[PDB]
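User: Modeling request: complex.
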Amino acid sequence: GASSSRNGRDSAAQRLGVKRYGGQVVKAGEILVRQRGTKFHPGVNVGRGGDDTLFAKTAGAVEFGIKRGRKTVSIVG
Amino acid sequence: MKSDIHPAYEETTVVCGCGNTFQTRSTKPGGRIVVEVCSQCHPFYTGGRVARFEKRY
Amino acid sequence: QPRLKERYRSEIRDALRKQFGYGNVMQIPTVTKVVVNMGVGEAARDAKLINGAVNDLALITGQKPEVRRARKSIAQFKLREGMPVGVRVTLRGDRMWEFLDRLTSIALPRIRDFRGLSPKQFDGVGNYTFGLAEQAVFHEVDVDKIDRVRGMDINVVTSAATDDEGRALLRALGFPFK
Amino acid sequence: SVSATRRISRLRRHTRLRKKLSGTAERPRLVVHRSARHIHVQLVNDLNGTTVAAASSIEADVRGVPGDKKARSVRVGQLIAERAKAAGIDTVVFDRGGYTYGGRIAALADAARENGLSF
Amino acid sequence: SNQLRVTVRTETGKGASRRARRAGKIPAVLYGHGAEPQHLELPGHDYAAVLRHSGTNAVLTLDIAGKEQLALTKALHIHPIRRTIQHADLLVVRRGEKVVVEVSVVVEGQAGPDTLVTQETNSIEIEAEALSIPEQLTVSIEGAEPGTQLTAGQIALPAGVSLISDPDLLVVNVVKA
Amino acid sequence: LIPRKVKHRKQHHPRQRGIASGGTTVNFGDYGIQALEHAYVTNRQIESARIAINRHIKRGGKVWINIFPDRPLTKKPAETRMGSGKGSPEWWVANVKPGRVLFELSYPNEGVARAALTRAIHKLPIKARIITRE
RNA sequence: UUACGGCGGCCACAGCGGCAGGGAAACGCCCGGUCCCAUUCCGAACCCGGAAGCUAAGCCUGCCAGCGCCGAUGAUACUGCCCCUCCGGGUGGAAAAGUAGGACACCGCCGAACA
RNA sequence: UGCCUCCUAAAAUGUAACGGAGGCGCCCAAAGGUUCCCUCAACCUGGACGGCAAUCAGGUGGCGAGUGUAAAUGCACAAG
RNA sequence: GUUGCGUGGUUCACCGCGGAGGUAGAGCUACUGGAUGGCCGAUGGGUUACUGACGUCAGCCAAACUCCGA
Ligand SMILES: [Mg+2]
Ligand SMILES: [Mg+2]
Ligand SMILES: [Mg+2]
Ligand SMILES: [Mg+2]
Ligand SMILES: [Mg+2]
Ligand SMILES: [Mg+2]
Ligand SMILES: [Mg+2]
Ligand SMILES: [Mg+2]
Ligand SMILES: [Mg+2]
Ligand SMILES: [Mg+2]
Ligand SMILES: [Mg+2]
Ligand SMILES: [Mg+2]
Ligand SMILES: [Mg+2]
Ligand SMILES: [Mg+2]
Ligand SMILES: [Mg+2]
Ligand SMILES: [Mg+2]
Ligand SMILES: [Mg+2]
Ligand SMILES: [Mg+2]
Ligand SMILES: [Mg+2]
Ligand SMILES: [Mg+2]
Ligand SMILES: [Mg+2]
Ligand SMILES: [Zn+2]
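Assistant: Request completed. Predicted assembly structure:
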């Protein structure tokens, strides 16, 4: 048998994606969209983070929107 | 950068052998540049086999 | 006051309005910059241009030039990125008019067997470029105290819109053409 | 053109520092607009886009100040210092407008710190 | 010339367009000079005959519940396997408007030598007014030598008709062998 | 027929479901063969149906093939257990959905061109028919 | 209220291009490099001091669908759930492309002219 | 045989096979922090040696270049 | 899964409202590749029946292509 296990390996899935959706009350510090890069950008009361994690700075409701093409994540305080 | 990096560029009297002269600014040490050909004493600024037979014969 | 600039605003400035029908006086062309470079490609090998190409354009043009580095690496020329290959000086203002004067008066008729610069050497816009072959054209360098010979090409950038509009400007300044 | 290059190259420097400096209702933004003859200034409050106070050199008070263009920059710096304290403003962020900090804009800001504003 | 009797659709959707086709009807819309579009049924077998003959442009005289209205045939939708008309688009014309219409192009002639007459399109888009003076545009190839390609120019277009496709559409090409 | 490069050498099987949406009409020629059912049409089957249309008209005409076999299939070695890898590519398949026009033809005579396209339906692993430009 | 100068909201229905017109204050080019400051070289730019020249360009206004952009209604593809041997059908959603068309943006605050 | 990226993976997350592709066991004292400034590749025209492509000047160019290193997500507002 | 003690509708279903997506489909002069027939033709080969780059006009395809998009 031809030992064609030349490619039999994978990394671990990193559980990315959006974690708190729109119209959802968050606390101060809650991680909203964990992601690679800035697929989503920080808006009002949202910080980016070290590995582009987009947490929360102030409690409130989460709403998504557009700001010159780049789509943003903001929190109404 | 416009302070004691650039060489000396002082005014310099230029003359020619024809007699033309003017006065500008150059890097020549001394100020006594002397040319032997200028833009007024140089050319281009101021401008058959059958015929050779009878010159022989 | 350089003698070619006050000659520019005396008859060259008015003779362009008869020859080309400009409505407004801000449309009259004027040379903006004169750019002089060596382009020493024999510095990827042996890397010696310090007294070579920097300390002679300082004597010819008037100020110290810019040691230009390479952009991409080319192996057929043995050229690697970030290696000095060109030496550029840019002339503006009063040192520009004192260079276009000193070129046409005492320098440019010292090309060996000179018969004129080609008037087809405009780039479709009105900017002129020609080349030289040695350093001894200019009297500010002495041939006894130099290294190997090297040449330069000279740009003359003008505000003109088309070729014959820019050809008429440099004709009145003192460039020969054939 | 030299005029079309200077307009695009200064509203690109102004949008660069606009990413990190907004100005709010309790801390407005002292925008400058420096030209060859005059300088303008206005506090903008970028939450509704509403100027709360403004000053310039096109008005007759600054026009009679003796001296050079730096000397007419100190007078317009003193005006908006006492036109912001007449509206409940004692701290602002400063906005270069895209220009380089120095000379006339620096003389405007040094005249607004000695007359009440606290940046 | 083309008398045609339509009716206004009761319910408009996926399930009702299938019930219309089993009853011998063709669903279509009638949108025009800025007015609101009508949603109407076609009688089926009669509509398939007033464009099998009389060309495919075929200015129709509709009868929308008594009211009279003229309309062109803009675009059909043919099923790829049944090859039957599914849906038509009709636009109205008020007795002369510079509409855009693609029209047939035929080839008339026989080439003499070893010549293969190849064609790249069977249609060019010409503009004209209402009831259609234009028809298929004959291109009389006289039997030329196989080196002369016939462009969208050198066309025998009638009067009152402009050619607005492009003046470089290769319509007839002749080559060797 | 074979491509000169493919980006991915070992691909999945192209899925045989759905009526075709492109290439459903005769575009270049006057007569054409329209498919009616799903099949993989290999490059041997096209080159056999090409030389049955050419060698029935024997001169003149023009034959279009607006179908290209660019999708590879794979094959294990002969006497092999399941699962030591995926096999090397053997065939070259053009996915043919119902409604797709396979071959096209321009010819002056009607009965010769129609009896030449029938001799290519018998070389293809589908049920087909001959359709005209209206 | 305006062939005005800023600052934003918005990010092509707004951009790109073509064609005409515009200078009261302003905006601009422009005139100079003594002064803080400046160029991997250059008062070109950045900066400062100016007001001899000009609307040529930027800018502003009017008009153009040309290249782009936006885009239904209808119909088909696809599909949740049921009935079905498949083919297909009932009910509930519904594109992409294309066509009719839209469109040379619209809105808020401050200053200057008018008022 | 552990870690990292894609697809399979059925539009959240997760998901197997001796399924389809590749990388890692580093490098950087600046390639880190900050402040300020800049816009590229490709192509067109002109230019001494100079060539398809060194350096120069001018057009056109909204991201096709670039990112220490694999791919994905990003990045021209720049993270270049 | 069962059972003791707590907690008490927090679970689940449907209708309404606010949300992120890149599958099916489709598209490709919107990118990376594959690719059929025309037209023009850089080079290459023997003045040019052979080669057909880059463009351009019609028709196409893709798990590791996406301007789109249920
Ligand atoms: Mg993974
Ligand atoms: Mg880190
Ligand atoms: Mg398709
Ligand atoms: Mg004025
Ligand atoms: Mg100056
Ligand atoms: Mg004008
Ligand atoms: Mg719809
Ligand atoms: Mg659409
Ligand atoms: Mg998933
Ligand atoms: Mg899923
Ligand atoms: Mg390995
Ligand atoms: Mg650093
Ligand atoms: Mg950087
Ligand atoms: Mg338990
Ligand atoms: Mg919903
Ligand atoms: Mg949704
Ligand atoms: Mg994907
Ligand atoms: Mg698909
Ligand atoms: Mg392609
Ligand atoms: Mg081709
Ligand atoms: Mg896909
Ligand atoms: Zn002389």
